[PDB]
Amino acid sequence: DEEKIDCYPDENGASAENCTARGCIWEASNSSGVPFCYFVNDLYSVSDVQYNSHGATADISLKSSVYANAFPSTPVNPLRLDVTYHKNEMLQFKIYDPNKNRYEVPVPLNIPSMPSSTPEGQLYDVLIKKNPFGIEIRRKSTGTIIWDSQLLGFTFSDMFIRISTRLPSKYLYGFGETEHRSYRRDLEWHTWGMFSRDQPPGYKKNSYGVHPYYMGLEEDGSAHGVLLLNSNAMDVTFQPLPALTYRTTGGVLDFYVFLGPTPELVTQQYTELIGRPVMVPYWSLGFQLCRYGYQNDSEIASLYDEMVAAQIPYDVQYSDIDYMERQLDFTLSPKFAGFPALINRMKADGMRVILILDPAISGNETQPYPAFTRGVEDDVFIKYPNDGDIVWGKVWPDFPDVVVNGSLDWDSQVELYRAYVAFPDFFRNSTAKWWKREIEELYNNPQNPERSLKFDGMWIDMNEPSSFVNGAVSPGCRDASLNHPPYMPHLESRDRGLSSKTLCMESQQILPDGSLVQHYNVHNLYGWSQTRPTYEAVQEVTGQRGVVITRSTFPSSGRWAGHWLGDNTAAWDQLKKSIIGMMEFSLFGISYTGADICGFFQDAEYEMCVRWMQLGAFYPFSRNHNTIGTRRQDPVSWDVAFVNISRTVLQTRYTLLPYLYTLMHKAHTEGVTVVRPLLHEFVSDQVTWDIDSQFLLGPAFLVSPVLERNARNVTAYFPRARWYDYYTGVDINARGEWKTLPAPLDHINLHVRGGYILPWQEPALNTHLSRQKFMGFKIALDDEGTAGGWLFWDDGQSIDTYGKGLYYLASFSASQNTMQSHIIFNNYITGTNPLKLGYIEIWGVGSVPVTSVSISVSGMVITPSFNNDPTTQVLSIDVTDRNISLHNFT
């Protein structure tokens, strides 16, 4: 019943007789999911197979054209398979066309210059199985088979490719941006679409990004990861006999397999190939505020001031497209002059500002509009292939004299009000200058230096590329590259073809090398094409590190950017998904992520929004965004109760900051994860394979959120190790157990893994005041392990600090009643430049109040006073009184 490989997933035409023309069997069924039409024999035969020390290779040819010709496109013949043993932990294998040069995905990966695999160390081995054609990758260590494509259905045709594989287990994690319902994916007959779309998340709907990467857990504890380097419109299909099916619409099949034994290792090797996450500036770790629809220039200041009054800390203030004159890039609304004033004033208090930018530039504008004009001069816009004119879409920008009525049909609006817009092709070295220059003159306004916006980071959005008209503007498109590309993957609005809510598939783009590519093959690649130049724009213009948040991602997209999870609704399910979403992106190689705290779409509810500020106070990207019409939902728009609560939780977060910042450091330099699923640190505990309602930050910090409405208590799993309650210092005392901890409406349970020590800093109203205050420690010993830890300090905003000199890195170990400090490299914390060391809590010291030694060193020893309660293992040790700094301590 499984083992049935759906022969007819085509949008139209599935039928008993149409199913026989393809060499298949049509047997109707009463079981949900199972394909009436399925395969009974192959159409390609692997022919010649050769092994060597550094790989394998084989030929694939047709038998017979009679049936292959009945499938979507024109089969290619023959094919060729090249399996390369790169490292001992990583493989690639690719099936391409040896004859004609097919579209291959133009993202740079790193790869040992020469296959560096050794027989003693090679961790896998591969066969090319002969009948039916199949590839079998295997972990040498145990027996387990990682990949097994010796299932039927393999198809190759210019614009339709299908390969399949057997999963070694019932545990599969992560795929290209969509709203999955749980972390571990279903397998019980499910198809998911993958294609850059402007889709608010929804079950089974292709959304902003595309990520054909998954992690698979094995029968024992072992983990592996697989990547399909394909940027064409595809879907994947999960089946109950553990097995999935790729159906791309046409590149080559470039696969990379990683098999570090552990989840964290899998991810280190994955990101090693595509690239490790960006390093964020310290200030980006702060809380953030924004909304679609700030009216008055000063409705913002009114907000910023109402916040600092309630002493609810927050580092970043935004503006949506309202700051723009009629939603035009690089224009300032009259309703918003002396916005520049606001910026400069807030950045002066120690705040930071991020600004949104869409990609679509308006060309129906009558006054002078540099952006669009110099855009046409430098020729940076996307246009049809036969020297045709620009491909005109529609998005936010309005026509110049038209009078807008919010009340109107949303279609009505798109026709009467919305200006024609051009889409810059971000591959071109030419579109780089233009873009960097527009960004440039936003920061340093050449004409009106009094209307310069001094942003700190850029938020590119609406870049899938999203257009409000399916295809292009007036008559439309004219093609078959566009609608019914022979196989129309299982996307949203399937009946609308790929044109839907975006550009014409035939639209020409030009790679950086100079060759010509059609939008068909690079659409999933668009927002990615735009990410690095934006990251560089903010870099050059601000002289600083900066940060970029982008909507559309592709693998390696996170090497320059972070990502938020898009247009969620203010609904209770949406809390749990933000956890899922974050974790999946940790996998995808994007560590700076989060959701729209309290919910973008629709009106916030008081309780839900309390809960969400609590959970979200622990997103690496903690922002409270909201759509246009809805009532405001920021922390100071509720009541004293709320304000008071938001203070407590945001304080807690501003404490974790030095730890969170080093996790960001480790993630950038080691590849390791940030928001880290429980199963990643406790793999042998199969209870964690399935828990997706709580997460770690790095290894030591366990966040156990309340995600239900009326509930004021939470059952949460606690793995085999020590879990000290972050607030009080007491070990909960569950080991591999489900507790039901108490959770008031003003509380969210945090716990610290015994064996780890967390640097922590005193909370300020913003990172600027915060970094000056007292640096603490929190040594969580374990009966289970004693204690380890790291801190990384930095000017928190310079470019490539680590990679060139000016940084500080120290490991910390507590063995027997005494904790030491090994400074690995120092270059930022000098005598003249001090890091105040305040307190030094320590939990789990024993019920015996007797120290064998009770006092600290610096080079010179001293015996300060301390509070020890034997009941609750705590051992507090205030030190504000000394002249103790981080560079002279021991």
Query: What CATH number has the domain spanning 1-38?
Result: 4.10.110.10
Give every strand in the sheet of 213-217, ordered side by side: 44-52, 55-62, 79-85, 90-96, 253-258, 223-228, 213-217, 172-173
List Cβ neighbours of 179 (8 Å cut-off, separation of 6 or more).
201, 202, 203, 205, 207, 577, 581
- Identify the CA nearest to 724 among candidates 701, 706, 743: 701
Among 465, 443, 477, CA closest to 361: 465
Distances (CA, A) of 213 to 256, 457, 565, 586: 9, 29, 18, 12
What is the DSSP track for 538-603?
HHHHHSS---EEESS--TTGGGT-BEE--S-BS-THHHHHHHHHHHHHHHHT--SEE-BTT-SBSP
Q: How far is CA 541 from CA 325, 442, 445, 457, 661, in A?
A: 22, 9, 12, 10, 24
CA gap 679, 688 in Å, rounded = 5
Residue 40, amino acid: V
**189 vs 515: CA distance, rounded Å:** 41
Tokens 């109950």 locate to 240
**Other CB atoms within 10 A of residue 403 CB:** 8
Cα dist from 406 to 326, 417, 778, whole Å: 13, 10, 54
Residue type at position 509: Q
Q: Check residue 484 and report its DSSP letter.
A: S
Query: CA 46, CA 60: separation in Å to the nearest integer?
Result: 4
Say how far apart CA 808 and CA 422 lie, in whole Å: 46
Beta strand 548-550 with 457-460 is parallel
As given in the structure block, the two tokens for residue 622 are: 């903690």
Please give the CATH architecture assigned to the domain spanning 755-890: Sandwich (2.60)
Question: From CA 578, how far away is CA 628, in angstroms rounded?
Answer: 21
Q: What is the DSSP letter of 335?
A: G
Reference 675, options 277, 289, 101, 232; nearest CA is 277
Q: Which tokens is 507 given?
A: 């639209």
Tokens read off for 706 = 């309340």
Q: How many helices (H) and strands (E) does the chain have?
A: 14, 46
Spatial strand order in the sheet of 393-398: 361-362, 418-422, 393-398
Is residue 134 within 8 A of residue 165, CB to CB? The reply is no
3-class secondary structure, 731 = strand
Cα separation, 13 vs 28, in Å, equals: 15
Contacts (Cβ under 8 Å, ≥6 apart) of 28: 36
Nearest to 382 by CA among 509, 505, 521: 509
Residues of the chain with CATH 2.60.40.1180: 656-754, 755-890
Question: CB count, 10 Å around CB of 799?
Answer: 15
Domain over 277-655 is classified CATH 3.30.1330.10: no
CA angle, 313 then 315 then 319, to 5°: 115
Residues 632, 626: Cα–Cα separation, whole Å: 8
Residue in the block written with tokens 């009114």: 302
- Best CA proximity match to 808, nearest among 789, 837, 828, 787: 828
Q: Tell whether domain 656-754 is in CATH 2.60.40.1180.
A: yes
Got the DSSP string for 797-833? Answer: SSTTTGGGS-EEEEEEEE-SS-EEEEEEE-SS--SSS
For residue 882, give the DSSP letter.
Answer: S
Tokens of 784: 């289970």
Give the whole-angstrom CA distance, residue 70 versus residue 24: 11
Contact at 8 Å (CB) between 160 and 142?
no
Per DSSP (E only), the strands in 734-774 are: 737-742, 749-753, 755-761
Residue range(s) occupied by CATH 2.60.40.1760 in the chain: 39-276
Bond into 465 cis (ω within 30): yes
d(CA 563, CA 782): 36
Nearest to 872 by CA among 732, 701, 722, 720: 732
Whole-angstrom Cα distance, residue 619 to residue 287? 9
DSSP three-state, residue 148: strand
CA 132 to CA 797: how far, in whole Å?
57
CA distance 718 to 242: 29
Query: Experimental method used, please?
Result: X-ray
What is the residue whose two structure tokens read 């505020």? 289
Residues 6+ apart with CB under 8 A from 214: 172, 173, 174, 175, 225, 226
DSSP assignment string, 172-206:
EE--SS---SSSB---SSEEEEES-------TT--
| Beta-sheet pairing, 749-753 with 701-704 | antiparallel
Give the residue among 693, 749, 715 at the shortest CA–CA distance from 572. 693
Q: What whole-number distance in Å separates Cα of residue 534 and Cα of residue 541?
A: 11
Residue 480, C-beta contacts closer than 8 angstroms, at least 6 positions apart: none
**CA 652/CA 654 separation, integer angstroms:** 6
- The span from the CA of 762 to the CA of 215, in Å, is 38
Give the DSSP letter of residue 166.
E
Which H or E run contains 660? helix 640-670
Please state, in angstroms and as integers, the Cα–Cα distance from residue 365 to each residue in 333, 357, 401, 420, following that order.
Answer: 15, 18, 9, 9
Q: What's the full length of the chain, in residues?
A: 890
Buried/exposed 519-531: b ≥16 CB within 10 Å, e otherwise: bbbbbbbbbbbbb
The burial class, CB within 10 Å (0-12 / 13-18 / 19+), for 188 is: exposed
Q: How far apart are CA 82 and CA 90, in angstroms?
A: 14
- Taking Cα atoms as reference points, which of 340, 358, 338, 453 lies closest to residue 398? 358
Residues 6+ apart with CB under 8 A from 5: 35, 38, 39, 151, 152, 153, 164, 245
Query: Rounded to 5 degrees, what angle do the CA atoms 676, 682, 685 make?
Result: 130
- For the record, the structure tokens of 556 come out as 């390696």
What element of type H or E holds 303? helix 297-310
Query: What is the Cα–Cα distance from 688 to 692, expressed in whole angstroms?
Result: 8
553, two tokens = 């991602």
**The two three-digit tokens of residue 338, written as one number:** 């002396």
Structure tokens at 628: 């246009």
CA distance 656 to 662: 10
The yes or no reply on domain 39-276 and CATH 3.10.20.70 is: no
Using the structure block, give the residue that is written with the tokens 């493989």: 91
- Alpha carbon 741 to its chain's center: 31
Report yes or no: 443 and 541 within 8 Å, Cβ to Cβ: yes
- Asked if 598 and 626 count as a contact pair (C-beta separation under 8 A), the reply is yes
The C-alpha atoms of residue 531 and residue 550 are separated, in whole angstroms, by 7
Q: Which two tokens stand for residue 421?
A: 């817009």
Residue type, 585: F
Residue 434, both tokens = 């233009």
- Tokens 């009941």: give the residue: 871
**Which regions of the chain carry the CATH code 4.10.110.10?**
1-38
Residue type (1 letter), 492 = E
d(CA 831, CA 42): 73
The 10 Å Cβ neighbour count of residue 746 is: 14
Q: Is 527 helix (H, G, I), strand (E, B) or coil?
A: helix
Count CB-CB contacts under 10 A for residue 800.
12
Of 108, 40, 890, the residue nearest 559 (C-alpha)? 108
Q: Report the alpha-carbon angle 131-136-138, nearest 5.
A: 150
DSSP state of 300: H
CA distance 586 to 267: 8
Centroid of chain to Cα 2: 33
Tell me how far CA of residue 488 lies from CA of 72, 233, 248, 507, in angstroms.
10, 8, 10, 18
Resolution at which this structure was determined, Å: 3.0
Tokens 């009966």 belong to which residue? 783
> What are the CA-CA distances from residue 131 to residues 41, 81, 388 (Å)?
10, 15, 49
Cβ atoms of residues 517 and 531 within 8 Å:
no
CA nearest neighbour of 200 among 611, 596, 631, 591: 596
- Distance (Å, rounded) from C-alpha 756 to C-alpha 785? 8
Amino acid in the structure at residue 672: V
Concatenate the DSSP letters of all residues of 390-459 into one string.
B--EEEEEEPSS----TTS-HHHHHHHTEEEEE-B-TTSHHHHHHHHHHHHHHHS-SS-GGG----SEEE
